[PDB]
Amino acid sequence: GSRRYDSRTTIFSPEGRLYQVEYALESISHAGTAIGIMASDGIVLAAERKVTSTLLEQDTSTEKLYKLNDKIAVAVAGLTADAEILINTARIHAQNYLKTYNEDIPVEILVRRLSDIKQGYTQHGGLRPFGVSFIYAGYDDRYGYQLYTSNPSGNYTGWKAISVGANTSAAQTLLQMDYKDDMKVDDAIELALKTLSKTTDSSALTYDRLEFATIRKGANDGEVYQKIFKPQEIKDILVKTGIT
Amino acid sequence: GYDRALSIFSPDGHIFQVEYALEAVKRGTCAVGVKGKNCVVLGCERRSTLKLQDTRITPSKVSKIDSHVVLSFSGLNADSRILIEKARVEAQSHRLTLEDPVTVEYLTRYVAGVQQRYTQSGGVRPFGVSTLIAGFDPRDDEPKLYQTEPSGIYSSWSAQTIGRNSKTVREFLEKNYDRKEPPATVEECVKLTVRSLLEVVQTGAKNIEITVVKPDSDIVALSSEEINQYVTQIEQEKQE
Amino acid sequence: QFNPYGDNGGTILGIAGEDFAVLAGDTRNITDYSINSRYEPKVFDCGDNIVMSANGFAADGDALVKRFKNSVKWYHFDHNDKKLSINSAARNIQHLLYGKRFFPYYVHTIIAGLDEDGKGAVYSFDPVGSYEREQCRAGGAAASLIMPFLDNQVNFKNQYEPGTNGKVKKPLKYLSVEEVIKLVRDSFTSATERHIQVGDGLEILIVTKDGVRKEFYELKRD
Amino acid sequence: SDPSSINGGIVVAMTGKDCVAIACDLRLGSQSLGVSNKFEKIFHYGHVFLGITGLATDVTTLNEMFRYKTNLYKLKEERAIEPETFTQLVSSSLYERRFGPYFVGPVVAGINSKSGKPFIAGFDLIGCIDEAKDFIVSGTASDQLFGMCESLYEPNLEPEDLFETISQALLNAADRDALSGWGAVVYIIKKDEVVKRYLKMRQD
Amino acid sequence: DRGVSTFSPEGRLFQVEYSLEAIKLGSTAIGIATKEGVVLGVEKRATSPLLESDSIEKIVEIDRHIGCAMSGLTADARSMIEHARTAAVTHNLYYDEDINVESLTQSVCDLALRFGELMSRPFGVALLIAGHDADDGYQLFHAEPSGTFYRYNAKAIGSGSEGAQAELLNEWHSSLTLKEAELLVLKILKQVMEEKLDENNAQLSCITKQDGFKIYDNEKTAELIKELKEKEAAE
Amino acid sequence: TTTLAFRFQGGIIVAVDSRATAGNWVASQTVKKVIEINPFLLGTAAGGAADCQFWETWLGSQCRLHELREKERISVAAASKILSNLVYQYKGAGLSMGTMICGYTRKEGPTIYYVDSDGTRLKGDIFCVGSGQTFAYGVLDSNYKWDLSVEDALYLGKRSILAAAHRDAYSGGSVNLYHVTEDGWIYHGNHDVGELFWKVKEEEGSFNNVIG
Amino acid sequence: NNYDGDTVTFSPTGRLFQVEYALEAIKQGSVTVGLRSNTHAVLVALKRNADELSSYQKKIIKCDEHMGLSLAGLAPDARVLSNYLRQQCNYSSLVFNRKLAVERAGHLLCDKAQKNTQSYGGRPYGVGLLIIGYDKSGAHLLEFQPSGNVTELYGTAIGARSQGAKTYLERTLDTFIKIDGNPDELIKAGVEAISQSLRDESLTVDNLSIAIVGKDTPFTIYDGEAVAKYI
Amino acid sequence: MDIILGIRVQDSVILASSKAVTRGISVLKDSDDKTRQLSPHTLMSFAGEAGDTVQFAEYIQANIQLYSIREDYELSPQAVSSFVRQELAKSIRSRRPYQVNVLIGGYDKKKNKPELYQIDYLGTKVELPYGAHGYSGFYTFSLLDHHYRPDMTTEEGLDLLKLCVQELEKRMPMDFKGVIVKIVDKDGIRQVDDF
Amino acid sequence: TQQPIVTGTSVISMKYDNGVIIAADNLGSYGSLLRFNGVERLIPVGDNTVVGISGDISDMQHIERLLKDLVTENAYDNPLADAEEALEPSYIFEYLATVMYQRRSKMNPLWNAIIVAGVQSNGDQFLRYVNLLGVTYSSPTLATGFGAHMANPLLRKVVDRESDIPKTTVQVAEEAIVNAMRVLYYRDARSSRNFSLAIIDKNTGLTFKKNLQVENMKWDFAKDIKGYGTQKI
Ligand SMILES: *[B]([O])([O])[C]([C][C]([C])[C])[N]C(=O)[C]([C]C1=[C][C]=[C][C]=[C]1)[N]C(=O)C1=[C]N=[C][C]=N1
Ligand SMILES: [Mg+2]
């Protein structure tokens, strides 16, 4: 019957590893590098678009940075189509919580929910896992500014600074070197761009090959503003930091 | 629905999927449990390969199931959340119907039953997780410490360890733990738990987590400095 | 509007002796003011030395007896031909009745036989399954006519010993099978006189350690 | 017994020259018992304003529901929903409960951000759209509001004049209804400024 | 791969035969039936000295008149015990009586072959079901994952089963007392066990008509062990 | 129906009548309205006979399963809540039940729970349930103390049922007495009202209204 | 070989190996004999024990007052099929007030076993059955194979060494068919028939199992000292 | 059941609930506590149809306690009240609706403010300085309208509450056997044992 | 739950020494309108059973189809379908009785009253009743609707108890049935003159008589009846 053709996506290897999860992580390692850096007064999200074209309409394009709600955003690394499935689920979960409790969802709760969905695909259903790794950048009134990451296994962890996708080993070493606890957003912006500029496989880092975003309390009085950077605004911050 | 039998017997009478789930536990960070005369202590290893971590928000290794029971684990982290969630739901369900919190044995029996169910259900793989469940029964001052594993078997332990290099720390506990006279105080019990982890951990900095559970829902997690004082005193006595 | 219930009249009577038990019932079957049948058996041998009757709505009565007879059959299959005791049969019938708690079998059920010590036994049920072991019970249309007579003549209620004047009760001496059958016949003859749904014939099933015997007697056909 | 008149209340909306106005009373009651004098019935999602009369539990539920839907709209569309589009969303959402409806009387008001055109609309409990040029009324004193609006209203009123007209329409209608009153709020809406005014009225 | 419900060329179900191998790896359990009662005994087999042995529960009560011992993948037995307890109590509810030991065993064995592609595999545990009823008196059954059950005068299952069965072959007779049966289980357990038999690594239990099913205390078993040592040294 | 139960120094007293009626017709005078759930638990029966019988013997099965699974006697609180949660599932369907779940455990002491087909579950010291509950309450409330002897408490319960048997048309037949202590319940006989009334009247000097 | 992984696969020569492997389980089972006359029908079954402490596995199952069978192979599969027969016999009685015909009982078993041979996931039954009964057309004997094939016979035998008993019955055909109104002699012939399949072991009091049904004889099973008469 | 009151003062929320339980013609109990602690700083009183009240209260209690354990964090009174409202709003269009009215009194530790919410069985939520369910409000709201002041102390709140209970005992036909009073403030929940 | 629309009236029957007789008129009424005048309400099953049906005609036609289908099904894999394993009256009845009680239990009844008349394999007379409620009973005489009130009294004068059956011949029994049909025509406002009669004898088999009429009617005395009391002309 049909058993003959079943790949069995949710089994252990003799070493106690999940085949499909490991192979999904291998896929993600070829995706464009995404970086998240958390500062005292905000969070930075920086990401590299993969080998673009001059004929790509950049100003209406979005492959890396997505908005989950007004307080929380994510950077993507892996299959974009897979990520959008999860992103729409996450957007709904945040709205369910808001409807139930009349309060914005705490960042960790949203992260745990998406991470639990990913876990399910590794334990039951016989389906392939989502080939996606997220960097969550968000704010709430309990823990303040927070950075998380999740991967196809459904495991998630918190970070001060973190990278996903390609060249994470090199990127993480550079972040570990220059990161300090009393750092500010403007400094973190510079660190994020400098790290991408050194780890990139491209010849030079330009505005058309980047997506950038900040989450600042730099909003008029006690509140939080999300800023998805425009192409011209990425070009300006590249000149300001002295990369172009 | 996906009905495929993933956990099945082999010619030599082994269920490889359950056995490979134990290998995932072997890979996981070390966890240890020691019960004294009037307390239980849960020690856990944090691998220092991950720095630049945010320890405020990172999921802690020891999880409260109820105000009087805790659960630590070794193995797949994502899998452990599912068992913890089910256990927490069952704990509140027990309070709701029986009008009494769960006994540590009951909660262990439930978690163990879930693990077993995943070894002979279609379309699912076993949990790659072993747990240490510790606490005190309601209105009882006798310490309780139980262990579970992917197959679904469970049992009570005077002291026990699970995870990577658990063979070494179990060796330590077997010679150092006396049944006729267990750690009489909190200090003695914590000291013995930190000592056992120091056989395996590497550095005694942010790599050791300790959680003390006392009777009547008295649970507290020790800080870095408090643990560091135990690490200092142990090695100074060792220099002799 | 459709009414799923009807009333087929009739009356039944169970009496437990010291080492025997009887279950009697008239053979008339009716709707409204018409006679359907002058001889329609109502008390049934269900095997394992148990007799049963479900009086009231005959369709529900037949359905229940049919299902209990079935339960006896499967009890033998599932438990190595073990004899179904009267107490076990009673509890089983409770579950059959309560299983239709919200659309009841519209019947008054009585079973009779011997208990495990060999003594006579009668059990009585309401439509939704409540039951109780009794020494004496009449059921159905003329139950209100017969029960008081049985309180008086079987349990010697309101009877005392001459000379003492209300001080000493009449002693509860046991009744033979010949004495019980006399009381059954008189009960039904009296019921036939004053209740229009009772008559035609009387069929009695007697249960002893030897088995199940039958006796039939003519009743007034008006 | 009648769900639409247990809690009581009213909403009214009007168009003016380059502006719209929406107003409501503040009462929530349990039949004859007055419970709350702070129960506002006007909500807003971006620049689109929604007033809802009727059963209060449904008023709350629908607000939470449209907040839910307009937030997802904005994330996907990358722009705020417009009054014309929102009107269709309300109609769709109400009709899906055709044979188990929310017992409400919604009213949409706002200015289209692109065309600048003033827009108002009303609905019945099951979705039917009433898109009037002049004014929309809703609630337990809808008859009273119709009478006030039909006599007081004139087209092309300036914002500060429109405020007086709508305020007098609400106040005098509420005072002829037992289940309306206990305070009132008026929103004056222009293309890029919105003023909110609480009215002093009789508290019986 | 291959079907879970597949027959081998010899006419045996692969999965059932493989589960029997898992049972051979399990700890020893012995049952002996007499006219005065039925005795059940097990090897606890703790993996480490730090493991509190009294928490090892390989002898289990199903009802007041039925007990049960297990051998193999003991986690698999929990749902079987739950079903047995439910069946026993349910029958009492429906029929106002105790359930026959054979009927209880049959109910448990009906679960056995409910596997396919229902549960994903057979049970990896064998059971010794001992009890008493009025019809057939004191009884001992051996319930396998094949769905088959045999009644026994005496039976051993687990790792030391064929050695123990041969010993039971010689020792059992129809006039055995309860005391004689208790000592006989202890004798045979001590013979096949790896570690030295004591009250902490071995457990006794019995079922009588009067007192019902009872798990023995460690103090009570310790005396029977001491009584055994002396009578073996007596000749 | 008249059933009562009350806590006191010597444990719990449970007393019930025996009558069952269908309209004005007296269907039975020998009804067992107390149920022996186990050697430590008792349940009283008022309202629908079948509902009470069926679900209380069912309750005994659930209690037996609990102590098989948990190796421990079920608490009165847990036993009562199993029954109250069950009837709550059937709420609206038409079940008719008024019951007391009476018992003693080490952790609770003597405990009584009123459980009812509307879903009501109440812990308390004194309860009277049934058509003749008001008559029983009169005698109980005026004579109740915590410091009653087992002998005196038993009589008070017997007397309170008698009071209701007399006045309430739908109560009567006979009185069943139970006494629940540290070591379980103890049955204290069937007392026919036809003999008990005249005995109490003569000895107690009560019921001077009636002629004898 | 490559075509025996499941029941849904024909081999190149048109064989169903999983069905054939199920047939093999019957040959491993203990011997049982069936025979009939015009008035009575008899089942004789050699019960098998695990060892000397064990009991002798029961081989005969009652389905109705007028019908029953003996089994050889997987006993749990016989329980499933006998339970199905019990239900079908019972449906016929409750709905139609009609005792189920033995021939129609065979047709129902055939169709139940067949579905398991044509569908993926399931498996064939691993047991063979000998059904005896007395209905409106007199005494009957059927032989059931888990391939689905059901056959009405005067006499037969299935299980290990069943060929010896089957040959004896083939010789005795003209004699035992005429044994009318004599149950003891018909059983004698059945006991003598099963004896042709014995090696090493002989028929003891707890070894032998006999069942009979006839004109004025309900289906009854004889075990223990009740069969000592025929040893 | 019958009477449940609530009043929010400067630094606390006070809930008063009747002790009587009546089934038909008899008062079966005169010491019943018509409240459940949802979290250390949140208390819910309830009144409605028999059985439904307790079943609903304990069901809510279990859900909030589950949240507290999962997140190791106490939900705000506003958040708890919204969860409760949604359950009742869901319930009203069910096969058999929960016939329960509630008051939720809580102290928000973040804002350092007491909060009182009134929710009926339809799922109608309102935040109030003082509230009541059933016929209680018909007597007590006039007194509270006069006497209430937003900055009363807890002692002043209890005195104003005594004036409400005295009026109820004078003019209501039903004997509700007095009230159990509970205070919710920064330090948690406590019961006034003499009232 | 429904209401009957097109309806059939009385079915009458009785036992005699060697068999059973059954009869029913050929009318299908639509309320007070005598709509359909050619409706056969006796339906034979094999050569040993006749099922007489009263009540709703649409439900009768459904039952007719069930019986037709029952014969077909019984023949399947049945070499003795026309012999030892043929359909008995008792089998046919029990089947219908099962269906009737099942349908009343789903609150969607077949709105009929049915009499199954026939002779068994051993020659025994079979006569049993079943209706929309699933109520069943047997008697030497059976009748539905108005027949119960008017026919039974007349037929019970011939066979009053079981012992009167051997003493009753086929000629005497048929005479009683035909008279009863006449009486029903006099007194039942939803009856017709035309009817069908069926005899099932253990010797001569099934005799099915169609197009029978009520004859020998007394009406002449009507001419003398004038007014309602005092009127003379
Ligand atoms: B008691 O009066 O509530 C009594 C207790 C019951 C357990 C036997 N109930 C009844 O007698 C009821 C009728 C009733 C009378 C008054 C109040 C409530 C109910 N009778 C029955 O349930 C019943 C059962 N079988 C036959 C006749 N009546
Ligand atoms: Mg009469």
Query: Radius of gyration (Cα) for chain G, nearest Å?
Result: 18
Q: Is the CB of F129 under 6 A from ligand 1?
A: no
- Residues of chain A with Cβ-Cβ distance to G120 below 8 Å are 1-2
Q: Which residues pair with A44 in a beta bridge?
A: A37, A214
Please state the atom number of ligand 1 nearest to the C-alpha of residue F45.
7
Query: Quick count: other Cβ atoms within 10 Å of Cβ C121?
Result: 26
SS3 B224: helix
Give the ligand at the shortest distance from the Cα of F29. Answer: 1
Pinpoint the alpha helices (H) of chain A.
19-28, 80-101, 107-123, 168-178, 185-199, 231-240
* B106's tokens: 């009951």
Is any ligand 1 atom within 6 A of the Cβ of residue F160? Answer: no
Both tokens of F203, joined, read 């000895």
Q: How far is CA E183 from CA C70, E39, E179, E222, G54, in A?
A: 48, 10, 6, 11, 21
Check if the beta carbon of residue B234 is closer than 8 Å to that of residue B197. Answer: no
d(CA B235, CA G162): 81
**End-to-end alpha carbon distance in chain B:** 65
Q: Where are the alpha helices (DSSP H) in H7-135?
A: 52-71, 77-91
CB contact under 8 A, H69 and B89: no
Which token pair is E117? 């592609």
Contact B155, B192 (CB under 8 A): no
User: Which residues fall within 8 angstroms of residue I209, CB to CB, at 6 or more apart?
Assistant: I196, I197, I198, I199
F107–B contact, CB cutoff 8 A: yes
Minimum Cα–Cα distance from E79: chain F residue: F69
DSSP-derived 3-state class of residue I128: strand
Question: Does the CA dihedral I218-I221-I227-I228 come out positive or negative?
Answer: negative
Neighbours of F148 (CB within 10 A): 18
F68 lines ligand 1 (CB under 6 A): no
Testing the interface with C: which of E90, E92, E93, E97 to mutate, by most C Cβ within 10 A? E97
Neighbours of C19 (CB within 10 A): 14
F22 lines ligand 1 (CB under 6 A): yes
- Ligand 1 lined by F49 (C-beta under 6 Å): yes
Query: Cα I49 vs. chain centroid, distance in angstroms?
Result: 12
H contacts of D99 (beta carbons < 8 Å): none
Number of domains in chain G: 1
Q: Which CATH superfamily is domain E1-235 in?
A: Aminohydrolase, N-terminal nucleophile (Ntn) domain (3.60.20.10)
Cβ(B108)–Cβ(B146) below 8 Å: yes
DSSP run (H or E) holding B211 = strand B208-214
Q: Is B76 on the interface with A (CB under 8 A)?
A: yes
- DSSP code for A166: T
Q: Dihedral sign for Cα H86, H90, H96, H97, please.
A: positive
**Containing domain of residue F112, as a range?**
1-212
Which of F170, F174, F176 to mutate to test ligand 1, by most ligand atoms within 8 A of the CB atom? Answer: F170
Atom of ligand 1 nearest to the CA of F53: 7
Taking an 8 Å cut-off on Cβ atoms, the answer to whether C134 and F30 are in contact is yes
User: What's the one-letter identity of residue B162?
Assistant: I
How many whole angstroms separate alpha carbon B98 and alpha carbon F74? Answer: 9
Dihedral angle over CA of B215, B220, B222, B223, nearest 10: -170
- List strand residue ranges (DSSP E) for chain E, in order: 29-33, 38-43, 59-63, 66-72, 125-133, 137-143, 149-151, 154-157, 202-208, 212-215
Could you identify the atom of ligand 1 that is nearest to the CA of residue F170?
2
Q: Most distant CA pair in chain I: distance in Å?
A: 76
CB H64 within 8 A of CB A101: no
Q: Which CATH superfamily is domain A1-244 in?
A: Aminohydrolase, N-terminal nucleophile (Ntn) domain (3.60.20.10)
CB F99 within 8 A of CB F114: yes
Q: Are strands E137-143 and D184-190 parallel, antiparallel or unpaired?
A: unpaired
Cβ(A53)–Cβ(A42) below 8 Å? no
Among H188, H48, H184, H185, residue whose Cα is nearest residue H120:
H48
Phi, psi of D149 (to 5 degrees): -65, -40
Distance CA E27, CA B34 (A): 27
F33 CA: nearest ligand 1 atom? 7
Rounded distance, CA G58 to CA C65, Å? Answer: 33
Closest C-alpha among I20, I9, I52, I17 to residue I177: I20
- Across chain F, the runs of DSSP E, i.e. the strands, are 3-8, 11-16, 20-22, 25-28, 34-36, 41-44, 46-47, 97-105, 109-116, 121-123, 126-129, 174-181, 184-192
Q: Tell me, rounded to whole angstroms, the distance of Cα E120 from its chain centroid.
A: 25
Give the dihedral of Cα atoms E207, E213, E216, E217; nearest 10 deg: -160
Burial grade of F61 (CB within 10 A; 0-12, 13-18, 19 or more): middle
Give the domain extent around D15.
Answer: 1-204
C-alpha atoms less than 13 angstroms from C-alpha of H140 in its C-beta half-sphere = 26
State in Å, rounded, how far the first CA of chain E is from the last one.
59
Angle between helices F76-89 and F49-70 (to 10 degrees): 130
Structure token pair of residue A61: 């394009």
Residue E209 has which token pair?
A: 């008509």
What is residue D133's DSSP assignment?
S
Nearest chain B Cα distance for residue F53, angstroms: 23
Q: Contact at 8 Å (CB) between F105 and F113?
A: no
CA distance C193 to C198: 8
Cα atoms in the Cβ-side hemisphere of radius 13 Å centred on H178: 9
Four-residue CA torsion sign, G54, G55, G58, G64: negative
Alpha-carbon G189 to chain mean position: 17
SS3 content of chain D, % helix, strand, coil (to 5): 30, 35, 35
Which among F57, F58, F68 has CB closest to E85? F68
Of E129, E163, E157, the residue nearest E143 (C-alpha): E129
The whole-angstrom separation of Cα D179 and Cα D34 is 8
Nearest CA in chain A to E117: A3
CB-based contacts of A145, cutoff 8 Å, min separation 6: A38, A39, A40, A42, A43, A138, A139, A215
Q: Give chain H's length.
A: 195
In chain A, residues with a C-beta closer than 8 Å to the C-beta of E2 are: 3
The C-alpha atoms of residue E220 and residue D199 are separated, in whole angstroms, by: 88
Q: Report CB contact under 8 Å: A98, D68.
A: yes
C-alpha–C-alpha distance, residues C127 and C60, integer Å: 10
Alpha carbon of G72 to those of G45, G104, I193: distances in Å? 9, 22, 67
Instruction: Assess B58–A contact: CB distance below 8 Å, yes or no.
Output: yes
**H37's tokens:** 């602690």
C128 in Cβ contact with C1 (< 8 Å): no
Q: Rounded to an integer, what distance in angstroms lies between the CA atom of residue B164 and that of residue B158?
A: 20
Answer whether A49's CB lies under 8 Å from A32's CB: yes
The backbone torsions φ and ψ at residue C108, rounded to the nearest 5 degrees and listed phi first, read -105, 110
- Lookup: tokens for I128: 């049993």
Q: One-letter amino acid identity for F70?
A: E
Give every CB contact of residue G157 below 8 A, 6+ residues apart in sequence: G31, G32, G33, G34, G163, G165, G166, G169, G193, G194, G197
CA atoms in the 13 A half-sphere facing the CB of D137: 17
C-alpha distances (whole Å) from E39 to each of E26, E33, E138, E198, I6 are 20, 6, 10, 17, 75
G185 near E CB under 8 A: no
Range of the domain at H94: 1-195
Angstrom distance (rounded) from CA B16 to CA B20: 6
> What residue in H sits closest to B64 (Cα-Cα)?
H69
Nearest to F78 among B99, B106, B139 (CB): B99
Pair G136, G101: CB distance under 8 Å: yes
Helix residue ranges per DSSP H, chain H: 52-71, 77-91, 136-147, 154-171
DSSP structural state of residue E173: -
Here the tokens at position E57 are: 């529960």
Can you give the length of chain C in residues? 222
Among F1, F34, F128, F131, residue to substitute to test ligand 1 (most atoms within 8 Å of Cβ): F1
Active site residues of F: 1
Helices (H), A74-167: 80-101, 107-123
- Name chain A contacts of D68, Cβ cutoff 8 Å: 95, 98-99
Q: In chain H, positions 18-57, which contact chain B (CB-CB < 8 Å)? A: none
- With beta carbons under 8 A apart, name residues in chain C contacting I109: 2, 4
Does F22 show up as a binding residue in the annotation? no
CATH number of the domain where residue G116 is located: 3.60.20.10
The CATH number for I134's domain is: 3.60.20.10
Q: Which pairs count as long-range contacts for C84-87, CB under 8 Å and 24+ apart, including other chains? A: C84/C47, C84/C48, C84/C50, C85/C115, C85/C116, C85/E97, C86/C50, C86/C111, C86/C113, C86/C114, C86/C115, C86/C121, C86/C123, C87/C115, C87/C116, C87/C121, C87/C123, C87/C133, C87/E96, C87/E97
CA of G2: how far to CAs of D63, G6, G11, G119, in Å?
65, 10, 8, 18
Residue H144 CB contacts under 8 Å (≥ 6 apart), including other chains: H7, H130, H160, H164
Question: Residue A169: what residue type?
Answer: S
Helix, strand and coil content of chain I, in percent to the nearest 5, comes to: 30, 30, 40
Q: What b-and-e string marks burial along H125-155, b requiring 16 or more CB atoms within 10 Å of the CB?
A: bbbbbbbbbbebbebbbebbeeebeeebebe
Query: What ligand is nearest to the CA atom of residue F47?
Result: 1
Task: Look up tokens 């107390």; give the residue.
Answer: F34
- Strand intervals (E) in F61-170: 97-105, 109-116, 121-123, 126-129
User: Is H12:H154 a contact under the CB 8 Å cutoff?
Assistant: yes
Q: Which two tokens stand for residue E17?
A: 């035969």
> CB–CB of H25/F129 below 8 Å?
no
Host domain of residue G122: 1-231
- Of B46, B14, B45, whose CA–CA distance to B32 is shortest? B45
Burial classification of residue D152, based on how many CB atoms lie within 10 Å of its CB (0-12 exposed, 13-18 middle, 19 or more buried): middle
Residues 6 or more apart whose Cβ sits within 8 Å of residue B173 = B32, B34, B159, B160, B161, B196, E50
B64 has a chain H CB within 8 A of its CB:
yes
Phi-psi label, residue A102: left if phi above 0, alpha if psi -120 to 50, beta otherwise: left
For ligand 1, atom 27: residue with the closest CA: F22
- Nearest ligand to the CA atom of F2: 1
**Which of D113-137 are b and which e, b meaning 16 or more Cβ less than 10 Å from the residue's Cβ?**
eeeeebbbbbbebebeeeeeeebbb
Classify residue D23 as left (phi > 0), alpha (psi -120 to 50) or beta. Answer: beta
Put the strands of the sheet holding B154-156 in their side by side order: B63-64, B69-75, B129-135, B144-148, B154-156
Taking the C-alpha atoms of residue B189 and residue B187, their distance in angstroms, rounded to an integer, is: 6
The structure tokens listed for G14 are: 């048109």
Tokens linked to F204: 């107690």
- CA angle (G126 as vertex; G124, G129 as ends), nearest 5: 110
Around Cβ C7, how many Cβ atoms within 10 Å?
15
Tell me the three-class secondary structure of chain G, residue by residue: CCCCCCCCCCCCCCCCHHHHHHHHHHHHCCCEEEEECCCEEEEEEECCECCCCECECCCEEEEECCEEEEEEECHHHHHHHHHHHHHHHHHHHHHHCCCCCHHHHHHHHHHHHHHHHHCCCCCCCCEEEEEEEEECCEEEEEEECCCCCEEECCEEEECCCHHHHHHHHHHHHHHHCCCCCCHHHHHHHHHHHHHHHCCCCCCCCCCEEEEEEECCEEEEEECHHHHHHHC
Listed in sequence order, the residues at least 6 apart from A7 whose beta carbon sits closer than 8 Å to its beta carbon are none
User: Touching D: which chains, 3+ CB pairs < 8 A?
Assistant: A, H
Instruction: Render the burial of E137-152: b for 16+ CB within 10 Å, e for the rest.
Output: ebbbbbbbbbbbbbbb
| CA E235 to the chain's CA centroid | 31
Beta carbons of G101 and I85 less than 8 Å apart: yes
Q: Name every residue whose Cβ is closer than 8 Å to that of residue C192 and which is 6 or more positions away in sequence.
A: C26, C198, C199, C219, C220
Name residue, tokens 């309108």. I33
Chains that contact G by 3+ CB pairs under 8 Å?
A, C, E, I
Helices (H) and strands (E) in chain C, counts: 4, 12
Q: From edge to edge, which strands make up the β-sheet containing E29-33?
A: E154-157, E29-33, E38-43, E202-208, E212-215
For residue B53, the 8-state DSSP code is B
G18: its two tokens: 């999983």
**For residues D44 and D20, what is the distance between their CA atoms, to the nearest angstrom?**
14
Say which CATH number the domain at F183 has.
Answer: 3.60.20.10
Which single residue is written with the structure tokens 């036909």? H173
How many structural domains are present in chain B? 1
Query: Are 3 or more Cβ–Cβ pairs between D and H shorter than 8 Å?
Result: yes
Of G17, C36, E6, the closest CA to residue I145 belongs to C36
Residues B164, B201: Cα–Cα separation, whole Å: 10
Q: Total structural domains in chain H? A: 1
Structure-determination approach: X-ray
Residue pair B43/B210 in contact by the 8 Å Cβ criterion: yes
- CB of G37 within 8 A of CB of G179? yes
Cβ–Cβ gap H76/A103 under 8 Å: yes
Tokens 């996907």 locate to D76
- C-beta of F45 in contact with ligand 1 (< 6 A): yes
CA distances (Å), origin E161, targets B188, E24, E43, E71, E189: 46, 8, 12, 11, 10
What is the domain extent for residue B114?
1-240
